[PDB]
Amino acid sequence: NLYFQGGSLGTLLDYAAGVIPASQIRAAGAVGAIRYVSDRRPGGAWMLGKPIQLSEARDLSGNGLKIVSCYQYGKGSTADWLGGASAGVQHARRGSELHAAAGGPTSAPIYASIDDNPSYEQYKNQIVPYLRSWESVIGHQRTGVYANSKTIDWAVNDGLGSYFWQHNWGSPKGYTHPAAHLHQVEIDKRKVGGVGVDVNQILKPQFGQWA
Ligand code: NA
Ligand code: NA
Ligand code: NA
Prior knowledge:
This protein is of the alpha/beta class.
């Protein structure tokens, strides 16, 4: 149960296991997708949904669906942010390249992923340099952050990131950070076109869509 904060402005799906036709996204009641501009990590060769390719972007856009870019390569003991400043330049450069190669415009942001529930120490020591490096590569105005509500608050206070996508791992129950553009409300509980999807709700009308 979410505290009321205004109601969803539409559903965006995210998925790593495969590519979903536009017609099936629409049929599922979604208005678009948040798609990976990242490679497949070790142990992730199954992730046929990484990265989004140009042919998919054209399908989605032609059907009037919204596209948002996000970036996540590693996870857990291989989380991207562990490497701080150097890792942020490496991942932002790669994300930038894959975004451009998918047809993504320079007017759209890329949501860098903090797929964790970090301590404030980890945040200051590792995540701050990581996100500052993202901003050095693509610019503040293009830097989005996928993170829990505590981490979004920290970033907002430090001036890091222009777009925020909240996850629930370490977020207070029912809470939606008021700076957030997008909220992941359900993970890996449903399939569309045979592909497992997470469900995200749009919180603000300008949320990083390509168009
Ligand atoms: Na709202
Ligand atoms: Na609303
Ligand atoms: Na809100």
